[PDB]
């Protein structure tokens, strides 16, 4: 049972991507279900436009996930999908927020994304020594990521400064 | 700040239909994420055909989970769809299988597909004298996911009797 | 060859559904054949508005005709759809009438519909103890059926009272 | 003149059940016709994801009016839908809100859900034992009201607990 | 709280086109309603053709109905969509025939359109030195509901001269 | 300049295809113009029903004159279709009906038609030996033709036998 | 036979936009045949863009013709649509160019819509105080009529100055 | 180079309808590339919204300049719609507003749609003497920007009464 | 391994057939190959209607030649479809003109149509004794084959005469 | 009122990007306003093959300034504009061409492609070192840019060599 | 007869992507007809799903083969496409299976893609220092093409370790 893996690429380097992309397809299944459950726990008298601004956001994410495993499952190892392996990789602590308002929600779902997009961001360049390709996956991903932070930000904007509940990392905004 | 709920139901029932639900809608947001893990740790000659008749599944279950889960909230309560509320109200094991020929995962879907049918089936029989439209609800689902489960099976059928990889809960047919 | 069945059903009332369906699957046969039949043999000023009023209910029954089926399949036993097996589980008469007046015609139909809305009517009641899904499956068919029979009385009704060709089986209606 | 109904239904009941829809079919024109009223005389600065959110509701409850009353014609009645037909078999009083916010319109809306869903609800079960085909037509309506009655409360609703405009029939909430 | 308007149009006039347009969006309404309730009410060997002829017309006027109202809520009023304000603004009598055949029902429907036909030509003149904007609007509207009157009426055209059920405001053809 | 035709087929043929596609190209022309005609001036209980059953049918003759012309200047000759050249090729007698009942014009197009495909099958019987492409062309044609003629005998069938308004070329049947 | 018309026309005028559509009517459907005559029988480098530029054209003329054929019939008069009517209310000659350059053929048309345009504009203006919704629909025509000319011209336009085959009825222009 | 126009039309007037219609293109021009700066400077809780609500708008307006564009060259002038024939024509001081919260954007863009709304409302009944045509096309764009401005008065409108930053050109509202 | 064919055709003919839509197989693969040639090496100022002319044509042949490649098979045999076996079947030159204007490319293309359509021509001619589908196959091709050298050829045509770089096999026309 | 920008990006960088987008924002302002222009002012025998050409391209233009602007935004600057910024961050030279051949315009506007495509490559290798998304952002313009002029060019291309009006800005080729 | 290229490279690049692209451009050419070839030529148990799962790739492919031929084109040089040009630039051998179960078609698939994906690994390395729109340009194609032979490989993998007919160049696994 020989092992595989792209043409004219080293073990030792495929590898290397799989592990990256596995921690980054757990990123995004913890996402898409997090986004999925601000969506249905949010209040406010903008609720509508928020609640149907995250499901293409929801869309987008779950295929980025499917994306991301098939290319590990590419390089030869086996994405890891289950409830199970999503917590493992996981890093960080399960989104605390529940029934709330828009403003609230949104202020947790910036910080969430600090982390997601600060992640891949870093995966990226590491991944450019590795394959330019799955380099090339991920920098496509990024893109939406970060417009979509944007569009949550843009909620908390200041008149024409910025961001209100400002970075008090889990909460800090009643205003 | 005074609790909602349907008009014409009695607190008690929303709250029991409610809980019903969410353990529903756990058992969903698993599936359709296992039902993806399998999606992707899939091998064999008949890889393709059964590689995409998950992915119609996939998107059914999901949407499932949004019916379910904005059908508590109507209720008055709060969905929970994160990673760790899915661990917490699940009541079984994570997916074990990994990659993997069709004929294996299939026998183990099938198994699970026995767990989440046989309890729909039966929050269907409990919510018939709590709420005849949640009811309506599940019992749309259930045909779904009865009929899902016989596509797996018809696979694993054998000649003119039935199933193969017969009656053994968690794996036991390399036949 | 262990024998298998929905996941929380007896096998003794299994085969009951199954039977019921299988009944069920012969008369939407006989139905979407018999519908075409007299979609090509009609005739009259009126024959374009009721040539083109069939079509759709032919596709509609063809379906009904799938699900049935494939439910009955999903229950554990085959399903059987050749001309011979419909002559079998027939208990009727062979559509009667040939080229002739849409208002013959209907007349016709309006009568075989009494008996396919009649007997699919009883199966609901019946099933109601055995498997509610498969019941629901019917009643889901049955407000179509009994929709089309409308589309074919308010053809025949009478100014502002009732139906014409009045209750006689098998014709009696050259008014 | 041979007055006619559904195969296997006694006349007793089939008159029984088109009561029942009659009195259904002129809610939903009425509600379709409000919804669309409050459309229009919205202002505030979420006017267009509410103006927005309402029009498939109203797009929604106009096919429920026409079900309703092709099931009431099927049924071996007539329906009855000009604007006197409305007022006459109207119980409540015709919405009073004109110009005015969102906040506003949704509670006075809120209310007359209220009275929908609960009157909804009421028929579905006396129905049980008339027609079950015309109490799942409701009961699918009845799903649909009560998901949109929701998606107006959770613009009401209060920071994680419930409803503003709190339990007050015909206004009551400038908070 | 300073009323708005139109730019360029004199607080005069807006209310002028405003009241033209408010008696104009209840005759709508009742037509739509009313167009619907023949829909549901018609019988004969030609019944299907008519039954779906209605449709598209009841979907086109629901539309007009729409346009009209916003423009009066641009030209600053508030529009009045409730059962109600129909029957307050309403000026004739509430369509008066039920279950009845094509023929019938048409020879109704023209002498109701002849009425709205009328009365629109009318507004369209008058509408002339206040808004040529709300003028083009109606002008729309008018080639299409004269067109649909034409349909109507081609139906009881006679042989080569014309219409029967001749000039019988309120019935007088059984013919 | 060198004229040029269909690489391996005869100077010869090639006019000889050239001519009886012309006569043909003139026929439809000829034909979606007063199939358009009848369109415009029927009248009757059973007017919506022919009034839109003509529409496809003139939008198909309409491309088969588009075909044959092009086939026509493939050929190397030059394809005539102003009103002019119609009259010259023209052998007939100019349609003759105006406003007047559906099963008038029925009967006049039956005539029509008549002509056109007695026309048709002799040219494909010629065409056989010059041009198998060619004929295949009208052969395609000839069966859309016949199929509509047969949907306006329908109209005029009898009871069970056939045809009423008999052959009794242009006009001949007030019954 | 009492013979009908617009409500609010007096059949004076009725029988005068009648008479003038009718002379429209004929203008189109010359139109949209010579249209696709030179559609087929243009020739050079430049061959498939006006080729197909030609087609839409074509369609939207159809259109224009059936348009303006049921106004008549709405009219209350009987819309002529042979090719002999066509030849009898026309006043001008047959469309003369055949195989020929897009060049030529431009500039004949440019001329043929010259003629178009300037009657239409006419029957506008009389149309005035006549009826303004047949007005209206000429105006529409008219936009789109005067759009096309625009793109023959352009390809007939001179290096900043203008057209070429200058003013010259019927040919006049090798360079 | 003969100087091309209208058929039926005097090249005074061409040229009048021409230097109407360049002083419209700019307006457009101006206010599709201003309605877009908004749209991606806004900021608040309602952005998403006002976001989306603006770019049917941009597309719309695009279209009028287009429209508007080949209609002068139709006339036979040249548009001119570079960025420096915009600052040309434009008469108005350049969008001042920068990042900030939708109720200052929407009131910034109530005030340029008076601009806009009120000068075309003038160039409509200038042109009613000299191009019917010309004058149709600026009414059908009036009514979609007229529209449009009550999508953003609405947004500001008062409780019942109306207009927040209240008839203050260039700001003036912090409330 | 019973070698199987066409139930009712001789052994004799299916290899007969096979043999004649293979070779016609390599004449569509290089063509559509050729076709895509020409398409990206043309210039002029003509470039982008010849350049996207083209392109239909490929995914025609192309299509082409999978069905005749299917029909092979479905004969029996195997069908050849790569570069080789087009080089090795191919019994003339490989397309010689590289980038250059569109009337060289033209006439170049004029003359390798010649060659197809003179050699489908014979293989119909042929195969009509042999397998009447396969010949009707053909014949359909045939017909889209013509029909786009006339498309060619109409761009080389002479002012009324014909073709230009007239008859000279392999490039003859700096004209 | 914290200043924001994207996750794991130097403030210093952030606005370094913002500022390269800003000017790539303004060259793509005037670029589709440009090309829209010479879409208008084009005259020649190849008018509609290049006046279609041009459409898409504008489209595609409008959204390349529409993404490069929210990129800014996301940056947590504020995109500009408005005609005025356009401008003023534009460094080159308004389009003079007005009324003109395509061989003009195209010419001309191969020249301002060479602005354009020359600019963005060297913002492409400066935000190397960056933001490689923002870099991924204009590398996918860029691409389509290119070829854009491609098809500009192939229209000016010589016979085998290379394009006519060489090198001579600002014009310089009556041939 | 200036020769030119993309604004802001060096002809030595431009030549150099150039001669690579042509390189790529016959591979891409060999392998969409190699595909297909394969596509007719398999039988099996797995026959369709592998039959339908090859022709997504061919048009992905054949669309790749243009991307890459009209960047060559936009490079300056001609793109060639002929069946010649491929046999020429082509380093390998012309795919040898022919009629043969998809395990085997699919393994020398296998190493057919290896070829491709390594040599387009190389260029894409290459080109990093030439053009990175090209580069980027590849890197797009490189991901496709890599995920293609990943589901062939899928096919051919082991248990739970990997490929069948394990690195044996040009056949070797009758297992
Ligand atoms: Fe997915
Ligand atoms: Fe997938
Ligand atoms: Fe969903
Ligand atoms: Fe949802
Ligand atoms: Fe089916
Ligand atoms: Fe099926
Ligand atoms: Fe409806
Ligand atoms: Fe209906
Ligand atoms: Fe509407
Ligand atoms: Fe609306
Ligand atoms: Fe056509
Ligand atoms: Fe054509
Ligand atoms: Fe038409
Ligand atoms: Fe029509
Ligand atoms: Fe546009
Ligand atoms: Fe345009
Ligand atoms: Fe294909
Ligand atoms: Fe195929
Ligand atoms: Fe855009
Ligand atoms: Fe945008
Ligand atoms: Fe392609
Ligand atoms: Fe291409």
């Known amino acids: 049972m020989t092992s595989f893996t792209i043409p004219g690429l080293s073990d030792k380097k495929a590898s290397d991507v799989a592990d990256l992309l596995q921690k980054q397809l757990s990123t995004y299944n913890d996402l898409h279900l997090t986004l999925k459950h601000v969506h249905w726990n949010v209040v406010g ?37 289950t409830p ?14 529940e029934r709330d308002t828009v403003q609230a929600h949104l202020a947790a779902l910036d910080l969430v994304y600090n982390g997601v997009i600060e992640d891949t961001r870093k995966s990226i360049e590491k991944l450019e ?6 380099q090339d996956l991920l920098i496509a991903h990024a893109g939406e990521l970060e417009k979509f932070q944007w569009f949550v930000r843009a909620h908390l904007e200041s008149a ?4 209100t509940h400002e970075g008090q990392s889990t909460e800090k905004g009643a205003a």
């Open 45 to 81: 008298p903008n609720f509508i436009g928020v609640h149907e601004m995250i499901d293409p956001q929801v869309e987008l994410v779950r295929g980025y996930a499917d994306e991301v495993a098939e290319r590990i499952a590419t390089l030869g190892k086996s994405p890891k999908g």
């Open 84 to 97: 199970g392996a999503i917590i493992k990789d996981r890093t960080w602590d399960d989104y605390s927020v």
């Open 129 to 134: 020594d590795l394959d330019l390709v799955s």
């Open 160 to 163: 024409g400064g910025q961001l």
